[PDB]
Amino acid sequence: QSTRVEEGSKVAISCSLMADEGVHWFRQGKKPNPEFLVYISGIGSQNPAAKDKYSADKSSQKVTLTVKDFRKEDSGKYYCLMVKNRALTFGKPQDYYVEE
Amino acid sequence: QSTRVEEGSKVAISCSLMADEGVHWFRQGKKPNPEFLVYISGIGSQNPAAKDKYSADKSSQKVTLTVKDFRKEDSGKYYCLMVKNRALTFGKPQDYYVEE
């Protein structure tokens, strides 16, 4: 089911949402608790600002999360979501792993 | 890993967050796309309002999602989350399933 990625490569993860407002990224890895990664605003600014590991970029209402230097601890199911009208909408989740 | 639940029973799902603002619930089932369930506001009002299947209730900053008449299509990993300061915080996920 999950896609094997070469250790140390750069993985560009697509969000299928029409990103007209801000988009949150999180992942569910092997560890029990999910991890918030980054948020990118409607105008394209990311929080936290640092782009050395997780770089969220937006063009024409399409947001892409680039996970740089993909390692075993980055393996998991990646989710993008938008909060609108007291509800959540999700992109298609994407699953990536480094062989252990 | 997941907890087997008796078909048709009522499952009260705990959210470990200190729920001082509103809490969203969603689940990841066998189907690829996650499903938004319900949101409960800081003051305790749920959207959508209907409580016949998913009833989110709050007391003393603790939110509990009750899944009534638990069936095979309700099996999955249940998440609660809060959106604060351009980021997401998650409760401990909880996993429930009906034997198939």
Numbering used by the authors:
A (entry chain A), B (entry chain A): 5 to 104
Which lines from the publication concern this structure?
The CD8 molecule is a type I membrane glycoprotein with two isoforms, CD8α and CD8β, which can form homodimeric (CD8αα) or heterodimeric (CD8αβ) complexes. To ensure efficient T cell activation, CD8 acts as a co-receptor to stabilize the interaction of TCR with MHC I on the surface of antigen-presenting cells (APCs). In this study, CD8α and CD8β orthologues (termed ScCD8α and ScCD8β) were identified in small-spotted catshark (Scyliorhinus canicula).
The structure of recombinant ScCD8α extracellular region was solved at a resolution of 1.35 Å with a space group of C121 and further refined to a Rwork/Rfree factor of 0.198/0.2. The structure is composed of two molecules arranged in the asymmetric unit. Despite low sequence homology with known CD8α molecules, ScCD8αα retains typical IgSF V architecture. Notably, the A strand is in the back β sheet, lying parallel to strand G’, an arrangement seen only in grass carp CD8α thus far. Two cysteines (Cys19 and Cys84) form a disulphide bond linking the front and back sheet of ScCD8α and stabilizing the IgSF V architecture. The ScCD8αα interface contains four inter-chain hydrogen bonds, which are formed by Gln32 (chain A) and Tyr83 (chain B), Asn51 (chain A) and Arg90 (chain B), Gln32 (chain B) and Tyr83 (chain A), Asn51 (chain B) and Arg90 (chain A), respectively. Five aromatic residues including Phe30 (strand B), Phe40 and Tyr43 (strand C), Tyr83 (strand F) and Phe94 (strand G) are located in the center of ScCD8αα dimer, forming a hydrophobic core with a BSA of 315.51 Å2 and contributing to 58.2% of the total hydrophobic force. The structure of ScCD8αα shows a canonical cavity is formed between the CDR loops of the two monomers. Structure alignment showed that His28ScCD8α is placed approximately 1.2Å away from the surface, which may explain the formation of the cavity.
